Each structure stands twice: as C-alpha cells, then as structure tokens.
C-alpha cells in the first residue's frame, strides 16, 4: 500500500442518546488509521534505523 | 414526503414551477440545520441581468423518517417572460421564530432545471395525497459540494424540454457571474480596509486611544496590540459574507456590530444589532457602547477585534486596548439599488 492514511468516521449516536445542546452533539467520531499499525517503544540502539 | 404535495396547493399556484428537493443529512451536517418542528422556511430568488428581487414565500418542510432520508422541501422557480435564466440563484433562508438562528442556503437553477429533465349538484373532493410516485434524481450543490435529491412527480409537455435562455455576448465569465455576491462584497471590504490604512497615514502611522482602559506595563503587550490591527486587516479583506454588518445598515428601514475571530480561534458572528445605542462619536455615546457585554471582552480580553457600523455607513475598528480608527464604507447610489434589491 501507499502512505498510511487517516480516515475519520463520524456516525450518529444510538437513539437512546440523541439529545444534545448543539447540532454536532448528536454525532460522535472516531479515527481509523488505515494501513498503519500500533507499536511499542523501539530500542534505542536502532533508533537511527 | 407530505410536504411536497402540500406545497403544490398553497405555494404551487403562486409560482411558475416548483423544485421538489429532499436534503440528506450530509447536506444538513455541512450547513448545520438543527431539525426541530418549529422551523419556518422562507424562499426568494436573486435574478441576474435584470432588476434582481422576487417576493418572499413560506415553504413547509418535514423530516422524512425511513430510498433517501432527511429534510424535504420544495423550492420555487420563477419564469419572467416565459423562460428561465440559467445563472439565477434561488436562496433558501432558514430561521427559528424565537431563538437567534438565521441560515442562508443557496441553490442554482442549472443544478435544478437539468435535474428535472428525464337534483343536488356535485362538489369536487380533492385532498392532499402522496399517491403520486417519486423518481429520485441525483444532484450536487455548486456552492458547498454536498449532494441533494430531486423528486420528479408524474402528472405540449413531452414534446418540449424545459425552456432556458442562455446569456448573450458580451458576458462576464460564469465563474464570476455565479458568485456575483461574493465578488461584490469582497471589493467593498477591500475598499473598507483601504480607508483604515489611509487613516493611519494622515495620523502618522499611529493608533490613538478612544476608550479609557488601563494597560498593564509591559513592552511585549504594546507590541501585541499592533499585531491585532495587522491580523484584522487579513480578516476584513478575506471576509466576503452575505450577512455582514454594513449590509444590514444599508437595508435598515441604530448601530450594527459584528465581532471578528482573529487568528481563526473563533467563528465569526455577524449582524449583531446595538439596540438603544446611538453612535454619534461624542464621549457620552461610547459609554453606552461599553455597557454591551461584547465590547467589554473585545477590549479587556484578546484575540477579538470588533467592527461597529453606523447607519451613515461610517465604521470604527475597535481593537483590544481601546484603540479605534474611523473608516468608511463607500456605497454609491447605483450600488444601494443593487444591495436593497437582492438582500433586503
């Protein structure tokens, strides 16, 4: 794949929770890092690599 | 889907053709339309190459609960002398009766006209019905880039397409005739800033106090207030909006105020009315300005400049620190007929 892209997912809330002050407060979001991965701390001996 | 068939009996005859339009949520999230049943819609169209105004009409709109889903409306189309114009904006104005909410939604006819293209005596009884089927045809708004649906209901009709009368030479380019409003207001704003920069040259590139507000003693603060004037000149030039303060002052029959969001930390609120304050320029009248809750935070706080416009089209740029510069919007008599027709 190409360079890892960030696609943000904005969905409507569940109809139990559809009450808010402003209009964007009915929608709650999430970021999905596409084609990347999660990782621990890299060793300091190969930080240059 | 009831609001289409209601409008054909009450808005329907008062027009020439209707533009049945259903707005999806992707359009509603962009223009931020909070769907309550209290909403009163109002529609009017802005003509081109003619004296531009049509009358205002109230159109009923209902939420459609689920094949699309969203707000359902009906837009009026006006045919002066037997034909449509292609570059002719239909403006939808959305407002609540009680609260502070005014939204302008703008449509173009070529996105709509193309989208329509494929013994006791008897008393009649004709109720409103959703019996007529719908044909869903796609579209995109030119101004925002959010898709909206158009219904085509079944009824010298099939023989002819919908009449259009394209403009004639010499003609400005249609990227400049579509945005007739945003190139008119932008040149008025760019000529407003040039009065402010000319007012510094006559004073010797200075900023004089007008509002008595004490300043804490630091040299970096005196450099910071100068940075609020240059940032406000990047904003007033870049701003070209339909509902600015001086436009409400030109179509007023009272000082008209709009604060600004400097360095993009705030969204702009435009057209705030100063009720009961007469901007005469005397030192008695600035105290009535200081009783406003906005002007206290534009001066004591930071990152917000403020523009106060008189009904004589003379305007001051209030900076934090109490500094102010008198400027003037220049509107000719030919320009006021252009503004009071389309906007007011």
SS3 B93: strand
Angle (CA) B2 B155 B129, round 5°: 25
Residues of B in contact with A27 (CB under 8 A): 29
Q: Do B250 and B333 belong to one domain?
A: yes
For B218-252, give the DSSP string: -HHHHHHHHHHHHHHHHHHHH---TT-HHHHHHT-
Q: Do B227 and B79 belong to one domain?
A: no
Asked if residue B331 belongs to a domain, the reply is yes
Q: Do B109 and B195 belong to one domain?
A: no
Q: Is the peptide bond before B170 cis (omega within 30 degrees of 0)?
A: yes
Residues of B in contact with A23 (CB under 8 A): 32-34
Q: Do B212 and B113 belong to one domain?
A: no
Backbone dihedral region for residue B242 (phi beyond 0: left; psi -120 to 50: alpha; all else: beta): alpha
Q: For A22, which residue in chain B has the nearest alpha carbon?
A: B34
Residues in Cβ contact with B123 at an 8 Å cutoff, skipping those fewer than 6 apart: none
Asked if residue B266 belongs to a domain, the reply is yes
* φ, ψ at B289 (rounded to 5°): -70, -40
* Residue B311 buriedness (CB in 10 A; 0-12 / 13-18 / 19+): middle
Q: Which of B82, B97, B118 is the last residue of a domain?
A: B118
Asked if residue B127 belongs to a domain, the reply is no
Token look-up 């007012």 returns B199
* Residue B13 buriedness (CB in 10 A; 0-12 / 13-18 / 19+): exposed
Asked if residue B154 belongs to a domain, the reply is no
- What dihedral angle (degrees, nearest 10) is formed by the CA atoms of B9, B10, B14, B16? -40
Q: Do B204 and B282 belong to one domain?
A: yes
Residues of A in contact with B32 (CB under 8 A): 23-24
Bridge partners of residue A11, in order along the sequence = A28
Query: Cα distance from B67 to chain A (closest Cα, Å)?
Result: 18
User: Chain B window 6-65: which residues touch A at a Cβ cutoff of 8 Å?
Assistant: 25, 29, 32-34
Cβ-defined contact of B32 to A27 (cutoff 8 Å): no
- What dihedral angle (degrees, nearest 10) is formed by the CA atoms of B1, B7, B12, B14? -160
Structure tokens at B232: 């406000």
Domain that holds residue B336: 181-344
How far is the C-alpha of B126 from the C-alpha of B22, rounded, in Å?
Answer: 25
Contact B284, B188 (CB under 8 A): no
Contact B41, B59 (CB under 8 A): yes
Structure tokens at B148: 């909206």
Q: Do B49 and B193 belong to one domain?
A: no
Please enumerate, as own/partner, the contacts of B224-228 that have beta carbons within 8 Å and a separation of 24 or more.
B224/B302, B225/B319, B225/B320, B225/B321, B225/B323, B228/B262, B228/B302, B228/B303, B228/B305, B228/B319, B228/B320, B228/B321
Structure tokens at B208: 């004089």
Bridge partners of residue B77, in order along the sequence = B17
Sheet of strand B40-46: strand arrangement:
B57-59, B40-46, B89-95, B102-108
Asked if residue B230 belongs to a domain, the reply is yes
Asked if residue B250 belongs to a domain, the reply is yes
SS3 B32: coil
Interface test with A, best of B34, B63, B103 (most A CBs within 10 A): B34
Query: Cα distance from B199 to chain A (closest Cα, Å)?
Result: 42
Q: Within 10 Å of residue B254's Cβ, how many Cβ atoms?
A: 16
Asked if residue B95 belongs to a domain, the reply is yes
Q: Do B198 and B337 belong to one domain?
A: yes
Q: Do B75 and B199 belong to one domain?
A: no
SS3 B217: coil
Token look-up 């970021």 returns A31
* Residue B28 buriedness (CB in 10 A; 0-12 / 13-18 / 19+): middle
Cβ-defined contact of B32 to A24 (cutoff 8 Å): yes
For B94-121, give the DSSP string: EE-SSSS-EEEEEEEGGGTTTTT---PP
Q: Which of B118, B136, B167 is the last residue of a domain?
A: B118
How far is the C-alpha of A11 from the C-alpha of A32, rounded, in Å?
Answer: 13
Asked if residue B131 belongs to a domain, the reply is no
* φ, ψ at B70 (rounded to 5°): 155, -155
Q: For B28, which residue in chain A has the nearest alpha carbon?
A: A23
Residues of A in contact with B33 (CB under 8 A): 23
How far is the C-alpha of B13 from the C-alpha of A40, rounded, in Å?
Answer: 69
Q: Count the domains in chain B.
A: 2
Q: Do B336 and B217 belong to one domain?
A: yes
CA max distance for chain B: 99
Q: For A19, which residue in chain B has the nearest alpha carbon?
A: B34
Residues in Cβ contact with B23 at an 8 Å cutoff, skipping those fewer than 6 apart: B33, B70, B71, B72, B73, B148, B149
Give the distance from CA B181 to its chain's centroid. 10
Which one-letter DSSP state was computed for residue B8?
H
Bridge partners of residue B269, in order along the sequence = B259
Q: Do B197 and B284 belong to one domain?
A: yes
Query: Cα distance from A24 to chain B (closest Cα, Å)?
Result: 8
Compute the half-sphere exposure of residue B119: CA atoms within 13 Å on the CB side of its CA: 3
For B127-178, give the DSSP string: -----S----B--B-TTT--B-EE-------SSS---B----SS---HHHHH
Q: Which of B118, B140, B173 is the last residue of a domain?
A: B118
Q: Number of A to B CB contacts under 8 A, please give it.
A: 9
Q: For B36, which residue in chain A has the nearest alpha carbon?
A: A23
Bridge partners of residue B46, in order along the sequence = B89
Residue B260 forms contact with A (CB below 8 Å): no
Backbone dihedral region for residue B15 (phi beyond 0: left; psi -120 to 50: alpha; all else: beta): beta
Contact B315, B307 (CB under 8 A): yes
* φ, ψ at B116 (rounded to 5°): -80, -15
Of B315, B303, B342, B343, nearest to B48 by C-alpha is B342
SS3 B305: coil
Compute the half-sphere exposure of residue B121: CA atoms within 13 Å on the CB side of its CA: 1
Q: Do B332 and B257 belong to one domain?
A: yes
Of B335, B162, B177, B146, nearest to B250 by C-alpha is B335
- What dihedral angle (degrees, nearest 10) is formed by the CA atoms of B182, B185, B187, B193? -130
Of B18, B178, B28, nearest to B103 by C-alpha is B28
Q: How does B103-115 read in b/e, with b if 16+ C-beta sit within 10 Å?
A: eebbbbbbbbbeb
How far is the C-alpha of B226 from the C-alpha of B222, rounded, in Å?
Answer: 7
Cβ-defined contact of A27 to B29 (cutoff 8 Å): yes
User: Chain A window 15-44: which residues touch B at a Cβ cutoff of 8 Å?
Assistant: 22-24, 27
Angstrom CA distances, B95 to B41, B102, B124, B200, B341, stand at 7, 5, 37, 41, 20
Q: Do B97 and B242 belong to one domain?
A: no
């Amino acid at each position: 794949p190409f360079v890892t892209q960030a696609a943000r997912v904005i969905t409507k809330r569940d109809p139990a929770q559809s009450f808010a002050t402003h209009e964007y407060g009915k929608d709650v979001a999430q970021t999905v890092l596409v084609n990347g991965f999660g990782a621990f701390a890299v060793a300091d001996r190969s930080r240059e690599a | 889907m009831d609001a289409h068939a209601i409008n054909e009996r009450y808005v329907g005859p008062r027009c020439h053709r209707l533009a049945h339009v259903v707005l999806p949520r992707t359009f509603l999230l962009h223009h931020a339309i909070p769907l309550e049943p209290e909403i009163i819609f109002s529609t009017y169209t802005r003509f081109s190459r003619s004296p531009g105004s049509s009358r205002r009409l109230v159109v009923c709109g209902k939420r459609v609960l689920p094949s699309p889903s969203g707000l359902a409306l009906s837009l009026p189309l006006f045919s002066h002398d037997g034909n449509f114009h292609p570059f002719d904006i239909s403006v939808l104005r959305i407002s609540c009766p009680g609260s502070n909410l005014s939204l302008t939604v703008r449509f173009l006819y070529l996105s709509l006209v193309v989208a329509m293209g494929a013994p006791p005596v008897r008393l009649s009884f004709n109720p409103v019905n959703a019996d007529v089927p719908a044909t869903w045809r796609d579209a995109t708004n030119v101004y925002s880039g959010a898709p909206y649906y158009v219904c085509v209901y079944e009824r010298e009709d099939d023989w002819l397409p919908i009449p259009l009368s394209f403009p004639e030479e010499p003609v400005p380019p249609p990227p400049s005739l579509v945005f007739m409003d945003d190139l008119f207001i932008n040149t008025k704003q760019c000529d407003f800033v040039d009065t402010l920069e000319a007012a510094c040259r006559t004073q010797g590139y200075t900023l004089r106090q007008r509002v008595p507000v004490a300043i804490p003693r630091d040299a970096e603060i005196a450099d910071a207030v100068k940075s609020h004037f240059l940032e406000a000149c990047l904003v007033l030039r870049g701003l070209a909006s339909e509902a600015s303060a001086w436009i409400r002052a030109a179509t007023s029959p009272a000082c008209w105020m709009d604060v600004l969001g400097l360095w993009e930390s705030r969204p702009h609120t435009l057209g705030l009315e100063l009720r009961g304050v007469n901007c005469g320029g005397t030192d008695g009248d600035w105290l009535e300005i200081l009783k406003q809750p906005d002007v206290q935070k534009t001066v004591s706080g930071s990152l917000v400049a403020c523009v106060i416009v008189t009904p004589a089209l003379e305007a001051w740029l209030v900076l934090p620190g109490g500094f102010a510069i008198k400027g003037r919007y220049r509107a000719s008599k030919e320009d006021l007929v252009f503004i009071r027709g389309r906007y007011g």
